[PDB]
Amino acid sequence: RHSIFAFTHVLIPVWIIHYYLKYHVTTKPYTIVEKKPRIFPGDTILETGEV
Amino acid sequence: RDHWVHVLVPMGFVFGYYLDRKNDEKLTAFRNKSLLYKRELKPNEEVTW
Amino acid sequence: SWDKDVYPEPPRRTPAPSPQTSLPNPITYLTKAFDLLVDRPVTLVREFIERQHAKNKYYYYHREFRRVPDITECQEKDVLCMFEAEMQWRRDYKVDQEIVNIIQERLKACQQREGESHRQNCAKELEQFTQVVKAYQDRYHDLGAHYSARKCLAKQKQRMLAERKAAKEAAAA
Amino acid sequence: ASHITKDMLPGPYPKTPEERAAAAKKYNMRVEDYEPYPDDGTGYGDYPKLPDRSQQERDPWYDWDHPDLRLNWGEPMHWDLDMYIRNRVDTSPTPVNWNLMCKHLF
Amino acid sequence: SGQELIISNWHWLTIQTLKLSLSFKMDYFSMMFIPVALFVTWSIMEFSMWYMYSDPNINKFFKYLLLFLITMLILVTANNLFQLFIGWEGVGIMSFLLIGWWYGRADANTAALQAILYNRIGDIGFILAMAWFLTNLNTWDLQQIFMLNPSDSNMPLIGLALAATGKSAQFGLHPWLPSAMEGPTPVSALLHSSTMVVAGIFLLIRFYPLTENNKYIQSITLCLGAITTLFTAMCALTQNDIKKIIAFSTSSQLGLMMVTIGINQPYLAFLHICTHAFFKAMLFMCSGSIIHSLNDEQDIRKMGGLFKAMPFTTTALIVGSLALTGMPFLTGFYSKDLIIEAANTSYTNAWALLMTLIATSFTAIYSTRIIFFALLGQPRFPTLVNINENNPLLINSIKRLLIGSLFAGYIISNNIPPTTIPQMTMPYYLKTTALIVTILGFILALEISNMTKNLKYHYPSNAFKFSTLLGYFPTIMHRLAPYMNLSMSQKSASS
Amino acid sequence: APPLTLEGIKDRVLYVLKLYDKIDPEKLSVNSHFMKDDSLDQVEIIMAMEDEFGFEIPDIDAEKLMCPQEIVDYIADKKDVYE
Amino acid sequence: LTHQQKVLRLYKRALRHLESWCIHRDKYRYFACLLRARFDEHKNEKDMVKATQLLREAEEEFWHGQHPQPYIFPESPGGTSYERYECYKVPEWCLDDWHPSEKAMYPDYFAKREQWKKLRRESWEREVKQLQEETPVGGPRTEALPPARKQGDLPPLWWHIVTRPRE
Amino acid sequence: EDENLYEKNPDSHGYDKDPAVDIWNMRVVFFFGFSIVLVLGSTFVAYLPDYRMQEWARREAERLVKYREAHGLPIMESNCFDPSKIQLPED
Amino acid sequence: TTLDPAEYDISSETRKAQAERLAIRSRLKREYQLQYYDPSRRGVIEDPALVRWTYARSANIYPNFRPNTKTSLLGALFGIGPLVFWYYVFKTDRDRKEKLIQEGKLDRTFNISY
Amino acid sequence: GKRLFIIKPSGFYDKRFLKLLRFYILLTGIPVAIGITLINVFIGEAELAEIPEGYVPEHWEYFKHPIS
Amino acid sequence: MLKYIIPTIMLMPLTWLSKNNMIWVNSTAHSLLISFTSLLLMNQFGDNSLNFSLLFFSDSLSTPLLILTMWLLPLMLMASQHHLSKENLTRKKLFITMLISLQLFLIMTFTAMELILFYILFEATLVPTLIIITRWGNQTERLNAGLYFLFYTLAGSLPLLVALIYIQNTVGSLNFLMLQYWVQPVHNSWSNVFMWLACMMAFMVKMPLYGLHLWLPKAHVEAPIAGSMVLAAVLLKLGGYGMLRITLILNPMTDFMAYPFIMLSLWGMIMTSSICLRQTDLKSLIAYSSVSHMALVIVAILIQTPWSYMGATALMIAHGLTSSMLFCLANSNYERIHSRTMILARGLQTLLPLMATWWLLASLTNLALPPTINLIGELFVVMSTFSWSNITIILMGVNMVITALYSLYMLIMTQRGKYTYHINNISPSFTRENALMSLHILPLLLLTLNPKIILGPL
Known part of the structure; x- marks a missing residue:
């Protein structure tokens, strides 16, 4: 056990910092700024296809 | 006695603060300004002078 | 929150992963387990505050000012009219600072979006941002009268040089 | 409160044999190659009788130096010649002056 | 699918036009180097549990070293040039607490004084490139720098190049690593292998979309790294310490990576960093068990053969030493070979290819030098042979590395999105002869080691030119620059 | 980590009497005084411990080393031997 | 230093500089007696310049080509890790001020600590009784009588008689 | 001739001067120095109100820019502060 | 370079009565160790070699000094020398930059900072 | 066996130090932390634009914060 | 300062009025209570400017600067008790009062509202600091260093009265830095050069230059008991901020x-x-x-x-x-x-x-x-x-x-x-x-x- 020596270590600060990001995107006008698709064909996420 | 050397001396602060409003209450020159700060019709720019 | 016209970006356009292979991939084991170990300690407590934060409301109000004089009033050695004009001009400058910060991150919206092309596209932010900051240091940046803050006594007089020497001493414009 | 020969004085020829060592024993009996003649050249603001410079120098280098501590760490009594340049400096190695590094950079 | 990110967490102070808050960078180096950098540190502390086993001051070490990872990790995650300057100095201030671990010792504390001296020259170059971005570019976030490339990047990037010379051990600053070895052994296994020397060139790697033009840059870059190879080759000859022999050998690795910038090869250069970090943190630690076995000589003198009840650590060295010959198919084959054969198509000095490829032999003769003098001959060293190799704490460290070490260049490069175009033409008499250059280094060192062992008794003649085993640079500059400025130029204009 | 006591040096100083082939193993053990057995008999007699011990043998170690147990005496002061 | 013992200071280092350059053990050992034949040139003679010209030509070929980074025997005046043990560094008498519940440990050690001090507290009726007597006026190196004519305690008591042990 | 004070350590602890009520000189400087100033005064300026009217001008900049972007109004004007109000003396 | 350093010379029999220069210091060393070894000292040694060092270095150089030589007036070539030279650099500076800033332009148009 | 006695200067005053340093900083710092948590939950601010506030505007307390 | 000088002057009839060795624990106790009053009424907003009450305070609006002025008096009393406790109690209490009196002039200074009250407060120091160098210092060569501590600052500061009254009778009145809206320019002359010269050179006496700074390693070298007023001499050197007040206006254009x-x-x-x-x-x-x-x-x-x-x-x-x-x-x-x-x-x-x-x-x-x-x-x-x-x-x-x-x-x-x-x-x-x-x-x-x-x- 390996019951609380790691659970106090890693398993507790997971929920706190994820709350600090879900309460962050709706407030700050620049959230995560993820880039473009980089897609060579045309796929089902769009309606058209490419050869 | 009741230790006037002690905390009676920091009690002079509000003794100074009671005198600290005498200068402002004779600085009652201008109400009619244009920084709103206007003293238009309200009992809010009149107060705390 | 905010208004989307202030911060525009094109829509997201996320494609399909296209596995195509019968080999076992680890991405079908990660998203199917880790989502519930986050939603339970976060979202329910976020809901528990959501009913508790709606117990009472508190108000804070906008501050809108009053601007009766603008520039040319008044006479030289005065004090009264030349104090409100300072409150005019100086609060007409700290507005003009953070307007540029909107347009600065507007450039940053394009650059970390495309990335690959990033120069030959977006059609505005290399132009329009340079149609602001170029139209900024002239007559609104007291170069180098910004130390004494140039309060109504040099910000008009750069604009005296912007009308006397400029546009008439071009011989003959 | 030490007043008798508390520092150096306007030397170096005010009976220089009576300087070392009536006090400030840099020389034993004014013939030790460390009599206070070595006022470099005076006239300047250098050292006067000055139990100071051109005595044998260029290193206290923390040697073997067992008859006292006596090298640089452990306070021999009165042998001050020069200081504040030597806690990080040394003596001569086996090679000699030859600036071959400029030829090596050539 | 990429999805590179920046964030917008918390404001710093704001000024007139620009506002920096904080942000991060997750492009090609955060998802690559950070699991590599942590894996080494995960495997290095078990030896320090055995190396620093007799010290009641054990708790300061694990505390000080962890914050040294923080200044090494916040630099690579940064995307504000203010944040890069934070990590640029934070890495050096920890070093004074690491070379200055052992108190006293009138050279090692001077070696702590020698350490921070040459670090500050690399500091003054980086701030010069900073202020030119303030004067023109209106900010110093790394986005808007790469938004528009300026015309005259010649003036800022020399300061970027001069900043690289402060910590990446270029010519003129070369005694910084052979002086920094005076501390404890896994200290120097960290200080010299995967930290404190990869960040000296890492800042140049981030600046790839600008370094193409402005042709004064590229000729200076590749010619500089060529000088760093062979002066470390000539001064390593007749060197009588194990740690000092490995000290020069990481510097000729730096002579490769400086040249890889001038040729427009960004990611193949960085992949050599991806492989090299495995090597000497193993090797100083593998050789550290040998020195602790004897507990006081640390000389290449008085060693013996390999098999004095020493099965395993001799097997661990020949994994490393054969890789250090120049990678026939070992650990760093997919990085070393794809660069010297990328020197085929180039526009160099052409003195550069007549200088970089020769050191490939000089790298190979470093290998057998510890085989032929510590692992080959008759057993000789002083008595009370108290050897010991039985500690599973050390066995856990060595086994964890060599599994990852051999599969280093063969798993990472096996799955990577491509960035550039390969050579794909390597003609007759021009293709793989640098491997043959490594082969003759075995031959040439044989007829010197065996000739110094079994010959017709070449008598010790006192006549030799020995300005090669010293270099003549620490002989005079450590006797002149703290003599002219410190004494004569001060006390004339002092009191 | 391995300690050391008085008995290790009492082996080695007596052993090198027989290791040196000029001195037979029939002399006195600890006090032979070396005059009954200028250079190379005050330096060569300790040039073997320059090979085995070899802590550079300072200048005062010559004039003390006549009495062969007085050799052994100060090593325990240098090597910090037990109790 | 004298002329006869000036030979001895060179003779040990003449061979000590050679084993730096050797690769084997017998290769160095074969040149021990081989260099001895040069030392056996003038076996026993007068102390004049004939013995100095044997040393006047020992200026060259001894300093000339001398020890290209030799063996140093690391616990030495030079050499690496020569004064490495300095985190401990033996602070002898750092143990005056304790303000106890920190002097709780080692009870018998402190009971013996004040015991040895009476040997130092009472020595100047004996050591200074001979300190004025043993020194003639101001002369040479000032060790006392090494038995102090009844009981030598120490003479160098106690900072040298309880000097710092190494670890 | 020479009278002076030495290391005050008569095997007691000592804070500033001596044993008793000068013993209170510790917790009059530990408790008043920090733990009230370094805590409450550190808290006081943490959430302190808008410095130099900044937080108004943050969201005020958010409002007015899109109104210039609404109809026709150019941005970064530098427009002579409502012209034809200055005679502009030539020479 | 710095130095040879002449670690060997001749003897036998130059200056036979020159010896016992250690008798000067061993008398002080006997005066040192007798001061060093005592049952109650509780303080530093006076050590007048450091007393005569700093006070005859920090002070008592201006009473020693006279301007009777020009090698004492030689500090004019080091103090005021480069101090004119930096201004001789800088007066040529800032005006050539200004003329290109007054007549003609070279700057970028987005130079708000500055 | 090999057993000796380590020589330390003193640990009393040094471990007496960091006590009241740690003690008094938790005597009022940790109790004041709850008020930073209690005012976060039960008290907020809402929302914007503007309000009209009648004719005469509101007094001081125009802030969007609990204690500001 | 409405009532900041007012509570701290009441601290002065408390030293010799008090008992025995209680005087250290009492003096430190009252002193930290003013530190909150400093923090509270200050640090307000904030947009050009906070004219505080009247003709004696402009509230240190542009630069706060005043929090640092008030740490030191409940910081040096714990430092000065190292080697002071050898004298009579009435003589030791005088050494306490003069350091407290040093703060009161500097409390009114750094805000000062004016310029004619500035210079009398700019020179209101150097009286208590000089006495600290004379009595209860260190070994000799004190008295010349006390004279070098004078005869520089007083030597350079006297043309300010030549400068300021020459401004007061010429253009308006220098009571108000905020009635400095009309400022005539200053052209290059042979009279106006000296007008800028006396306006500036006195401020180089305190924050030093490569010239005229030999006195500075005298007061810090020959210094009181254990860095007692030496900590106050740190604020005495940095407290020459008044160039920020003056040369921001009042001949700005002389940069030639x-x-x-x-x-x-x-x-x-x-x-x-x-x-x-x-x-x-x-x-x-x-x-x-x-x-x-x-x-x-x-x-x-x-x-x-x-x-x-x-x-x-x-x-x-x-x-x-x-x-x-x-x-x-x-x-x-x-x-x-x-x-x-x-x-x-x-x-x-x-x-x-x-x-x-x-x-x-x-x-x-x-x-x-x-x-x-x-x-x-x-x-x-x-x-x-x-x-x-x-x-x-x-x-x-x-x-x-x-x-x-x-x-x-x-x-x-x-x-x-x-x-x-x-x-x-x-x-x-x-x-x-x-x-x-x-x-x-x-x-x-x-x-x-x-x-x-x-x-x-x-």
Whole structure:
């Protein structure tokens, strides 16, 4: 056990910092700024296809 | 006695603060300004002078 | 929150992963387990505050000012009219600072979006941002009268040089 | 409160044999190659009788130096010649002056 | 699918036009180097549990070293040039607490004084490139720098190049690593292998979309790294310490990576960093068990053969030493070979290819030098042979590395999105002869080691030119620059 | 980590009497005084411990080393031997 | 230093500089007696310049080509890790001020600590009784009588008689 | 001739001067120095109100820019502060 | 370079009565160790070699000094020398930059900072 | 066996130090932390634009914060 | 200050009125209560400006500057009790009152509302500091250094009355800095040059130059008991801020003759750093460091155009905490070794391991570790004078390189062996030695969390 020596270590600060990001995107006008698709064909996420 | 050397001396602060409003209450020159700060019709720019 | 016209970006356009292979991939084991170990300690407590934060409301109000004089009033050695004009001009400058910060991150919206092309596209932010900051240091940046803050006594007089020497001493414009 | 020969004085020829060592024993009996003649050249603001410079120098280098501590760490009594340049400096190695590094950079 | 990110967490102070808050960078180096950098540190502390086993001051070490990872990790995650300057100095201030671990010792504390001296020259170059971005570019976030490339990047990037010379051990600053070895052994296994020397060139790697033009840059870059190879080759000859022999050998690795910038090869250069970090943190630690076995000589003198009840650590060295010959198919084959054969198509000095490829032999003769003098001959060293190799704490460290070490260049490069175009033409008499250059280094060192062992008794003649085993640079500059400025130029204009 | 006591040096100083082939193993053990057995008999007699011990043998170690147990005496002061 | 013992200071280092350059053990050992034949040139003679010209030509070929980074025997005046043990560094008498519940440990050690001090507290009726007597006026190196004519305690008591042990 | 004070350590602890009520000189400087100033005064300026009217001008900049972007109004004007109000003396 | 350093010379029999220069210091060393070894000292040694060092270095150089030589007036070539030279650099500076800033332009148009 | 006695200067005053340093900083710092948590939950601010506030505007307390 | 001078003057009839040794614990107790009143009514907003009440206070609106003025009096009384307790009680209490009286003039100063009340308060000091040098100091050659402490500041400051009354009778009245709206320009003449000259030269007497600064390593070398008023002399040197008040207006356009003040403070900057690597005194060691990066701020002001007022606001308090903390290190290690000469301190780091951390972080504020309050302002001095020309980074950057050696030149002197001596210096760093050594970095890095308040107008 390996019951609380790691659970106090890693398993507790997971929920706190994820709350600090879900309460962050709706407030700050620049959230995560993820880039473009980089897609060579045309796929089902769009309606058209490419050869 | 009741230790006037002690905390009676920091009690002079509000003794100074009671005198600290005498200068402002004779600085009652201008109400009619244009920084709103206007003293238009309200009992809010009149107060705390 | 905010208004989307202030911060525009094109829509997201996320494609399909296209596995195509019968080999076992680890991405079908990660998203199917880790989502519930986050939603339970976060979202329910976020809901528990959501009913508790709606117990009472508190108000804070906008501050809108009053601007009766603008520039040319008044006479030289005065004090009264030349104090409100300072409150005019100086609060007409700290507005003009953070307007540029909107347009600065507007450039940053394009650059970390495309990335690959990033120069030959977006059609505005290399132009329009340079149609602001170029139209900024002239007559609104007291170069180098910004130390004494140039309060109504040099910000008009750069604009005296912007009308006397400029546009008439071009011989003959 | 030490007043008798508390520092150096306007030397170096005010009976220089009576300087070392009536006090400030840099020389034993004014013939030790460390009599206070070595006022470099005076006239300047250098050292006067000055139990100071051109005595044998260029290193206290923390040697073997067992008859006292006596090298640089452990306070021999009165042998001050020069200081504040030597806690990080040394003596001569086996090679000699030859600036071959400029030829090596050539 | 990429999805590179920046964030917008918390404001710093704001000024007139620009506002920096904080942000991060997750492009090609955060998802690559950070699991590599942590894996080494995960495997290095078990030896320090055995190396620093007799010290009641054990708790300061694990505390000080962890914050040294923080200044090494916040630099690579940064995307504000203010944040890069934070990590640029934070890495050096920890070093004074690491070379200055052992108190006293009138050279090692001077070696702590020698350490921070040459670090500050690399500091003054980086701030010069900073202020030119303030004067023109209106900010110093790394986005808007790469938004528009300026015309005259010649003036800022020399300061970027001069900043690289402060910590990446270029010519003129070369005694910084052979002086920094005076501390404890896994200290120097960290200080010299995967930290404190990869960040000296890492800042140049981030600046790839600008370094193409402005042709004064590229000729200076590749010619500089060529000088760093062979002066470390000539001064390593007749060197009588194990740690000092490995000290020069990481510097000729730096002579490769400086040249890889001038040729427009960004990611193949960085992949050599991806492989090299495995090597000497193993090797100083593998050789550290040998020195602790004897507990006081640390000389290449008085060693013996390999098999004095020493099965395993001799097997661990020949994994490393054969890789250090120049990678026939070992650990760093997919990085070393794809660069010297990328020197085929180039526009160099052409003195550069007549200088970089020769050191490939000089790298190979470093290998057998510890085989032929510590692992080959008759057993000789002083008595009370108290050897010991039985500690599973050390066995856990060595086994964890060599599994990852051999599969280093063969798993990472096996799955990577491509960035550039390969050579794909390597003609007759021009293709793989640098491997043959490594082969003759075995031959040439044989007829010197065996000739110094079994010959017709070449008598010790006192006549030799020995300005090669010293270099003549620490002989005079450590006797002149703290003599002219410190004494004569001060006390004339002092009191 | 391995300690050391008085008995290790009492082996080695007596052993090198027989290791040196000029001195037979029939002399006195600890006090032979070396005059009954200028250079190379005050330096060569300790040039073997320059090979085995070899802590550079300072200048005062010559004039003390006549009495062969007085050799052994100060090593325990240098090597910090037990109790 | 004298002329006869000036030979001895060179003779040990003449061979000590050679084993730096050797690769084997017998290769160095074969040149021990081989260099001895040069030392056996003038076996026993007068102390004049004939013995100095044997040393006047020992200026060259001894300093000339001398020890290209030799063996140093690391616990030495030079050499690496020569004064490495300095985190401990033996602070002898750092143990005056304790303000106890920190002097709780080692009870018998402190009971013996004040015991040895009476040997130092009472020595100047004996050591200074001979300190004025043993020194003639101001002369040479000032060790006392090494038995102090009844009981030598120490003479160098106690900072040298309880000097710092190494670890 | 020479009278002076030495290391005050008569095997007691000592804070500033001596044993008793000068013993209170510790917790009059530990408790008043920090733990009230370094805590409450550190808290006081943490959430302190808008410095130099900044937080108004943050969201005020958010409002007015899109109104210039609404109809026709150019941005970064530098427009002579409502012209034809200055005679502009030539020479 | 710095130095040879002449670690060997001749003897036998130059200056036979020159010896016992250690008798000067061993008398002080006997005066040192007798001061060093005592049952109650509780303080530093006076050590007048450091007393005569700093006070005859920090002070008592201006009473020693006279301007009777020009090698004492030689500090004019080091103090005021480069101090004119930096201004001789800088007066040529800032005006050539200004003329290109007054007549003609070279700057970028987005130079708000500055 | 090999057993000796380590020589330390003193640990009393040094471990007496960091006590009241740690003690008094938790005597009022940790109790004041709850008020930073209690005012976060039960008290907020809402929302914007503007309000009209009648004719005469509101007094001081125009802030969007609990204690500001 | 409505009632800030008012409570602290009541602290004065409390020293000799009190009992015996209670006078130390009583004086420190009242003193920290004013520190909240300083924080409370100040730090308000904030947009040009806070004219406070009337003709005696303008509330220190553009630069706060006043919080640092009030730490020191509940900070030096715990320091001065090291070696003071040997005299009569009535004589010791006078030494307490004169330091408290020093704060009251400086409480009205730094705000001062005016200029004719400025100069009488600009000269209201130098009376209590001089008496501290005379009685209860150190060994001799005090009295000449007391005379060099005069006859410079008083020598340069007297043409200010020649300058200011010449302004008061000419153009309006200098009672109000805010009635300075109409300001006539100043052309190049042979009369106006001296008008700018007397306006500036008196302020170079306090913050020093490469000239006229020989007095500064006299008061810090020959100094009171254990850095007692020496900490106050730190604020006395940095408190020449009034150039920010004056030359912001009132002949701003004379920059043609700015150059010999730019150049002299620049080659003298790089020089006086290296003028102390062969110094043999501890209290002189920090003194010449306190010349160099205090001479950094002068070229930030005569060069106008902010991004220079930003850092110069912070660089006054930069060494103002740091050199005050270094003097606290130097006031310690003197009650135990009764000579201040640094060379005798070989063999440290082993007897005092607890304060050895405090040596590290203190000298880590000269290398200065760029997330601090020191290298956040020195980057803005870079940001200003590089726009002046491209050469200015050279001499200013080497200043960041010489003090890299010059700070670690002190740290390595602690690490030596066997110490040769010292049956005294036993005391393992008592409570007064380390609690007073705190409360310097404890607000300093605290201010590095949100450094928004340390900013001028600007």
